[PDB]
Structures are given as structure tokens and as C-alpha cells.
Amino acid sequence: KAQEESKIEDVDKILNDILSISSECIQPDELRVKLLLKRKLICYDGFEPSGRMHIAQGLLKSIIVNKLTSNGCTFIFWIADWFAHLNNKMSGDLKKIKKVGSYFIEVWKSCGMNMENVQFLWASEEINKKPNEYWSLVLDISRSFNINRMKRCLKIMGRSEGEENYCSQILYPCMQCADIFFLNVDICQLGIDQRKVNMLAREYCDIKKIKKKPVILSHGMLPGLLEENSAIFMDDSESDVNRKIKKAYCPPNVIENNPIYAYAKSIIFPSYNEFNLVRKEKNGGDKTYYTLQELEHDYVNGFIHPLDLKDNVAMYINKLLQPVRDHFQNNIEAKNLLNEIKKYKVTK
Amino acid sequence: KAQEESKIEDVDKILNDILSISSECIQPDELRVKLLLKRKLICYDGFEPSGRMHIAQGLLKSIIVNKLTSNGCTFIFWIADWFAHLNNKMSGDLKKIKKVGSYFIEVWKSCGMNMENVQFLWASEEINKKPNEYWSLVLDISRSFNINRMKRCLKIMGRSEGEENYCSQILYPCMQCADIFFLNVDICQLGIDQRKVNMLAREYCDIKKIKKKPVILSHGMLPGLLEGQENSAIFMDDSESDVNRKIKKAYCPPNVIENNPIYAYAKSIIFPSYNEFNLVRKEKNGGDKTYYTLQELEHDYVNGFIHPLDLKDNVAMYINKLLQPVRDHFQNNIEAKNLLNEIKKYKVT
Numbered sequence: 088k089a090q091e092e093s094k095i096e097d098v099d100k101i102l103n104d105i106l107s108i109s110s111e112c113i114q115p116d117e118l119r120v121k122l123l124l125k126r127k128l129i130c131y132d133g134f135e136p137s138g139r140m141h142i143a144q145g146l147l148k149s150i151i152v153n154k155l156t157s158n159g160c161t162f163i164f165w166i167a168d169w170f171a172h173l174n175n176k177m178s179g180d181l182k183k184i185k186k187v188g189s190y191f192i193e194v195w196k197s198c199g200m201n202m203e204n205v206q207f208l209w210a211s212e213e214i215n216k217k218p219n220e221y222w223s224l225v226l227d228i229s230r231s232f233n234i235n236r237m238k239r240c241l242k243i244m245g246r247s248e249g250e251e252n253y254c255s256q257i258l259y260p261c262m263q264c265a266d267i268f269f270l271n272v273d274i275c276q277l278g279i280d281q282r283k284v285n286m287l288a289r290e291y292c293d294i295k296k297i298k299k300k301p302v303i304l305s306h307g308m309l310p311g312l313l314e315e316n317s318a319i320f321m322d323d324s325e326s327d328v329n330r331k332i333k334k335a336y337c338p339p340n341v342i343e344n345n346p347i348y349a350y351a352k353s354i355i356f357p358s359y360n361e362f363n364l365v366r367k368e369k370n371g372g373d374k375t376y377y378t379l380q381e382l383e384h385d386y387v388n389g390f391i392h393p394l395d396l397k398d399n400v401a402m403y404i405n406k407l408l409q410p411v412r413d414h415f416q417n418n419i420e421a422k423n424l425l426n427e428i429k430k431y432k433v434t435k
Numbered sequence: 436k437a438q439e440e441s442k443i444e445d446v447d448k449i450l451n452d453i454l455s456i457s458s459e460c461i462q463p464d465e466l467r468v469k470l471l472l473k474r475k476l477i478c479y480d481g482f483e484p485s486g487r488m489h490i491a492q493g494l495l496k497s498i499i500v501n502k503l504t505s506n507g508c509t510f511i512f513w514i515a516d517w518f519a520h521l522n523n524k525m526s527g528d529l530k531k532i533k534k535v536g537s538y539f540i541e542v543w544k545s546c547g548m549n550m551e552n553v554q555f556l557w558a559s560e561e562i563n564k565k566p567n568e569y570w571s572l573v574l575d576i577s578r579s580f581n582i583n584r585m586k587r588c589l590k591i592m593g594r595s596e597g598e599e600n601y602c603s604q605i606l607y608p609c610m611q612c613a614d615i616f617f618l619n620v621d622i623c624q625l626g627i628d629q630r631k632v633n634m635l636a637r638e639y640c641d642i643k644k645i646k647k648k649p650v651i652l653s654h655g656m657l658p659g660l661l662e663g664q665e666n667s668a669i670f671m672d673d674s675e676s677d678v679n680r681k682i683k684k685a686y687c688p689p690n691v692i693e694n695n696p697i698y699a700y701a702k703s704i705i706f707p708s709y710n711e712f713n714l715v716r717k718e719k720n721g722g723d724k725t726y727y728t729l730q731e732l733e734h735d736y737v738n739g740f741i742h743p744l745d746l747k748d749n750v751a752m753y754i755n756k757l758l759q760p761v762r763d764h765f766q767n768n769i770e771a772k773n774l775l776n777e778i779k780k781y782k783v784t
């Protein structure tokens with residue numbers, strides 16, 4: 088027959104693709120086993136509703152999510168409303184956190200996630216449907232690890248250790264760890280800045296002799312726009328994008344920590360399977376890049392000047408944000424929601 | 436007009452009465468104010484179902500609760516089953532913890548308390564009836580205090596600082612603090628070893644601008660039977676000979692009251708149980724005598740008018756009389772006898 092061989096090849100391809108969009112996988116052979124389970128894998132990422140959405144959580148997220156769901160997975164977006172509250176976001180105000188969460192969902196559905204295999208789940212709603220199960224997990228995790236081990240998860244709250252260490256910094260990682268089991272996740276697909284608590288979950292499996300362990304499929308962090316005006320938001324207008332890109336950090340010849348180059352490589356190139364650099368002839372002229380290898384060689388050797396990369400990145404970000412811009416300009420309810428949340432003060 | 440004066444006098448009597456069963460009150464002025472509210476005050480104590488019941492948690496508790504419920508209070512016994520589990524009691528085993536909690540309730544119902552204003556509430560059951568309210572309190576408390584402040588509450592878990600500090604030692608005090616608000620308590624009536632988390636609740640009110648603050652009415656810790664404190668305390672299932680053997684060997688310094696745990700039993704359990712202490716002695720040792728005030732009893736023993744061994748002999752027989760109706764419940768009620776049999780087989784962790 089040879090169908091067996093064809094299925095092995097199919098699995099190898101799905102595995103190479105799933106691994107492609109990741110900066111790290113813990114562990115690849117485990118991911119291969121999960122796939123042979125012959126079933127939809129559950130992936131998830133989670134989000135504090137803390138203010139307008141940075142393009143990392145919309146444009147970049149949509150690329151990874153569509154890759155995974157098109158390869159048979161279901162993807163949960165965990166709107167971590169209680170976590171934002173625990174982390175002092177939006178003045179702790181749950182009404183504001185809820186409005187922001189609603190705005191997140193509007194963004195995601197207009198930026199490539201209006202689809203059957205993506206679920207938008209609210210942490211508070213889901214915890215309160217099964218609160219004995221949820222909080223019993225949280226308490227059992229807290230019994231298994233000492234305070235220092237848990238303090239090492241502080242990066243998941245976006246915090247440095249030099250500040251005051253509130254007890255919330257213990258509860259939050261216990262709860263994020265519980266989420267991984269509570270949602271029956273196969274793949275934790277969060278930014279690499281979440282790795283500590285994802286590793287904690289794997290350690291908890293070993294402690295409890297739980298053989299079903301989650302695969303950590305972490306994506307890379309987009310560097311900050313600068314080395315409000317500090318990030319591109321998913322709702323930004325064309326002039327807002329143009330202005331923020333013009334002033335962004337884009338060191339000549341340097342890719343490390345370069346946000347402009349990161350947008351080209353991680354958002355724009357996968358979206359178009361190319362990068363078209365429009366330039367005057369005296370600056371090298373237009374050029375179409377078909378590989379990231381050439382783009383990197385050309386930027387590192389100075390063939391691409393920062394101003395040219397910036398102009399092209401701005402044009403592409405505006406093209407990619409068009410359906411979001413249009414949704415929030417033309418849909419009256421979404422326009423009114425954005426107008427409300429834009430007035431909120433951003434806290435921590 | 437004569438009614439106004441009489442209302443004041445009544446409150447003063449009730450205040451001094453409630454305060455008598457306490458070793459510390461934070462604060463008496465606040466308790467007076469609570470007493471003027473013209474509604475029942477909610478009091479509570481909570482208990483990890485962890486093994487045998489200490490005589491302090493059965494006989495002494497019933498003396499205190501009877502005082503409070505006859506003085507305008509309602510009293511909650513909080514069966515802290517999830518806390519026992521969090522604190523690694525009974526192998527963490529929630530089935531054993533539930534069995535032991537059932538046994539505690541059986542004991543308390545035979546301990547001589549007026550039950551019309553007493554409730555037995557299970558932590559897990561009540562929390563899961565209102566889990567959004569409860570866990571939102573827990574998280575807000577955790578946002579309000581730093582880790583070091585919460586580590587200083589470790590005594591409430593019966594643990595020493597030299598050991599490994601599991602994160603459960605942070606969740607537990609946040610949760611005990613939450614209980615105080617979740618149950619809408621007016622008076623936290625626990626042992627003085629719970630003071631840190633009770634102080635935490637008060638501080639939390641100040642932080643949140645909550646003017647309704649709980650009064651901490653702490654009772655004293657009953658000392659261990661041996662000098663400087665199994666054989667270190669009476670438990671609620673102990674037999675008459677168990678009591679006799681443990682009291683007989685207890686520390687009872689002749690002519691000295693301080694740290695004499697026998698005297699601690701006379702003063703905190705027996706005297707409030709009988710509104711007196713009737714000291715039986717042979718005529719050659721002074722003959723029987725009734726002390727009607729603790730000042731009187733203390734005066735006679737500190738000056739050597741009371742033989743230590745006479746205090747032991749009576750403390751033991753009075754403790755035996757007091758445990759009799761629990762013994763009877765567990766001999767004659769068949770389901771109770773078997774519950775006690777099962778829970779005595781548990782390994783204490």
C-alpha cells in the first residue's frame with residue numbers, strides 16, 4: 088500500500104512546520120508523540136487586558152495561530168482578566184479590564200482569527216464554572232514548590248525583582264501554572280518571557296507522576312520599538328504608524344534588539360512570502376527579497392539603510408492593519424468601544 | 436430615663452463578661468462599640484481536622500462559646516478542611532480530613548454547648564458556594580501585603596521557620612485572612628497563636644478604608660502538662676485512667692502557681708464550668724473549700740494554702756467528670772463509636 092510511509096511523511100512535515108514558527112520547543116520528540124495521538128491538539132496563549140493591543144499580540148500572533156490551526160489544532164485565547172487585576176493593570180478596575188478584553192476579541196476577529204478552531208475564553212468565567220477543580224489545583228501546586236522557586240517566575244508578570252514583592256507574585260504563577268492543566272493544554276504557545284512558569288508546569292508533572300506533559304512551543308519576543316509612542320498598536324491609524332516607525336530604534340547593520348528588522352522578518356516576510364524594498368535607484372533601487380537569509384546579509388552588510396527599511400516596514404504594517412482599521416472606523420459599536428478604552432490610564 | 440442607665444450598666448456587665456474568657460482583646464473599646472450595635476455579633480474559631488481533638492479545642496471551647504452565645508453572640512465553628520490539606524495533615528488525604536472533621540462535630544455536640552446560636556461550617560463547602568467572592572478576597576489580600584509580612588504569619592500553621600518554605604505558607608494565611616471577611620466576623624475568637632493573621636485582617640481594613648473592623652478576642656494557650664511546655668496534653672477521647680496517668684505525672688510545683696499547668700486547667704476550664712472551684716481535701720490538709728474568684732484561688736495557692744497534689748487530684752477528677760458525656764456519646768451511639776474507631780487508626784502528619 089505505502090499509506091504508512093505517506094502518513095509518516097505527513098507527520099514529519101506538520102512537525103517541521105509547527106517547529107518553524109517557534110524560537111524554542113521543549114521538546115521536539117515529545118511534540119512528534121503528541122501528533123501521533125491522532126487528535127486535535129489543544130494550544131493556548133493568554134493575555135492580560137492591560138491597554139491597547141501591541142502588534143506582537145495581533146499581527147505576529149495571527150501568523151503562528153493560523154499555521155497551527157490549519158494543521159489540525161485548536162487554539163485557545165485565554166483572556167486573563169483576573170490576572171491583569173492581580174497584576175494591578177487598568178487601576179485594578181474589572182469593568183475596564185472587561186472592556187479591554189472585549190476590544191481584544193474585536194481586534195483578533197478582524198486580524199485573522201475569526202474562525203472555528205480559535206476559542207476566546209475568559210479566565211474568570213471559566214474558573215468560576217469549575218472552581219473546586221481550579222482552586223484545588225492552585226493549592227496543590229502551591230504545596231509542591233518553595234517560595235524561591237516561585238519568585239523565579241516573576242518575569243511572567245513583566246516585573247523585576249528589585250521592586251516590592253507582593254504575595255500576588257506567588258499566587259499569579261501558581262494560577263498560571265494551574266491554567267495549563269485546567270485547560271487540558273497540549274502545547275503552551277506563549278512568548279519566551281513566559282518560559283519559567285511553563286517549565287514549572289512540566290516539573291509539576293514529574294512531581295505528581297502525571298505522564299501527559301505539555302510541550303512548550305515558545306515564540307520569540309519582538310524587541311521594544313524604542314531602545315503611547317512606545318509601541319505600535321493594532322488600532323493605530325496610518326499616520327500614527329508612520330510617525331512611530333519613523334522614530335523607532337533601528338541600529339545600522341544590527342539585527343539584535345532591532346524592532347524594525349524584527350517586524351520585517353517575523354511579521355511581514357511570512358505574511359507575503361517576500362519582502363519588497365522600495366527605494367530610489369541611487370540608494371540601491373527597489374528589490375524583492377525571497378529569503379530571510381538575503382535580507383539579513385543585506386542589512387548586516389549595510390546594503391539596506393535604516394530609513395529605507397523603516398519606510399517599507401511602515402507601508403507593510405499599514406497594509407496588514409487595514410481590516411482592523413476598517414473594522415474600528417466603520418463598525419459603530421467597535422468605534423465606540425475603542426473610543427472608551429483609549430481614554431483609560433495605563434497602570435502597573 | 437432609668438432605662439438609659441440600666442442599658443449602660445447591662446452593656447458594661449456583658450463587656451466584662453465577654454472579656455473574662457480572653458487573654459487579650461484588640462480592642463476593648465471597639466468591643467464595647469460592637470456591643471452597642473443592637474444585633475448579634477458573629478464570632479468564630481477555626482480548626483484543622485488533623486488528628487485527635489485537644490482538650491482546649493473541645494472543653495475549653497465549649498466554656499467560651501457558652502459565655503459568648505449567652506451574651507448576644509452567634510458562633511461559627513469553621514471546619515478548616517482545605518487548610519488541613521494545604522498544611523499537609525493526615526497525609527493531605529481529603530477523605531481522612533473529612534472523617535476527622537465529622538468526628539470533631541460529634542465531640543462538640545456532646546460538649547455541653549447551647550446550640551441554638553452555634554453553626555458548624557465546612558470551609559470547602561462554604562467557599563464553593565461563593566467562590567468568586569471568596570477567591571477575589573484572597574487575591575486582593577495577596578495584592579496588599581509583601582511576602583515577608585505573610586511569612587511572619589507562619590505560626591498560624593504551627594510551623595517553625597527553619598524548614599522549607601512552600602508557597603502554601605503564603606496561600607494559607609491569605610485564605611485565613613479572607614475567612615474573617617467572608618464569614619462577616621465581628622469577633623475572631625481563636626488562640627493567641629493565631630494573632631498574626633488576625634492582626635493582618637485589621638491592617639487590611641486600614642489599607643482598604645474599611646471601617647468595619649474585627650475585634651480580636653484571643654484566648655490563652657493551654658500549657659503542656661510537662662515542665663517548660665501525647666503525654667503533653669489531654670485529648671477529648673482520653674479515658675479516666677488516661678487523664679489520671681497524664682495529670683499524675685504533670686508538672687505541679689508545690690506552693691507555686693506560675694507555669695503550673697494543673698493550675699492552668701483549674702483556672703481556664705474548671706472554674707468557668709462550675710462558676711467556682713470546689714477544692715476537695717482531707718480535713719488534715721484544710722478540708723474542702725470553695726474559691727469563688729480567681730483572685731481567691733490564686734491567693735491561696737501562691738501562699739501555699741493549697742497542696743499541689745491536692746490540685747492534681749481534683750483537676751483530674753473534674754476533667755474526668757467533664758469528659759464523661761463525650762465518653763458516653765462515643766460508647767452508646769454506635770455510629771459515633773465506629774467513627775472514633777476509624778479516626779484513631781489515622782497516621783498523624
Ligand SMILES: CC(C)c1nn([C@@H]2O[C@H](COS(=O)(=O)NC(=O)[C@@H](N)Cc3ccc(O)cc3)[C@@H](O)[C@H]2O)c2ncnc(N)c12
Nearest residue numbers: 133134135141143167170243263266277278279307308309
Ligand atoms: C508586548 C509584550 C508585553 C509582549 N507580550 N507577548 C506575548 O503576549 C502574551 C501576553 O502577554 S501579557 O498580556 O503581558 N500576559 C502575560 O504575560 C501572561 N502572564 C498572561 C497569562 C497567560 C497565560 C495564563 O494561563 C495566565 C495569564 C504572552 O505570550 C507574551 O509572551 C509578546 N510576544 C512577542 N513580543 C512581545 N513584545 C510581546
Ligand SMILES: CC(C)c1nn([C@@H]2O[C@H](COS(=O)(=O)NC(=O)[C@@H](N)Cc3ccc(O)cc3)[C@@H](O)[C@H]2O)c2ncnc(N)c12
Nearest residue numbers: 481482483489491492515518591611614625626655656657
Ligand atoms: C493544638 C494546640 C496547639 C492549640 N490549638 N488551639 C486553638 O485551637 C484552634 C484550632 O487550632 S488548629 O486546629 O491547629 N487550627 C489553626 O491553627 C488555624 N490556622 C485553622 C483555621 C482557623 C481559622 C481560619 O479562618 C482558617 C483556618 C485555634 O484557635 C488555636 O489557636 C489551642 N487553644 C488553646 N490551647 C492550646 N494548647 C491550643
Ligand SMILES: [Cl-]
Nearest residue numbers: 217218219220
Ligand atoms: Cl469544580
Ligand SMILES: [Cl-]
Nearest residue numbers: 565566567568
Ligand atoms: Cl460568589
Ligand code: NA
Nearest residue numbers: 202203205206
Ligand atoms: Na472561534
Ligand code: NA
Nearest residue numbers: 242243244245
Ligand atoms: Na507579560
Ligand code: NA
Nearest residue numbers: 366367368373
Ligand atoms: Na524605486
Ligand code: NA
Nearest residue numbers: 590591592593
Ligand atoms: Na495550629
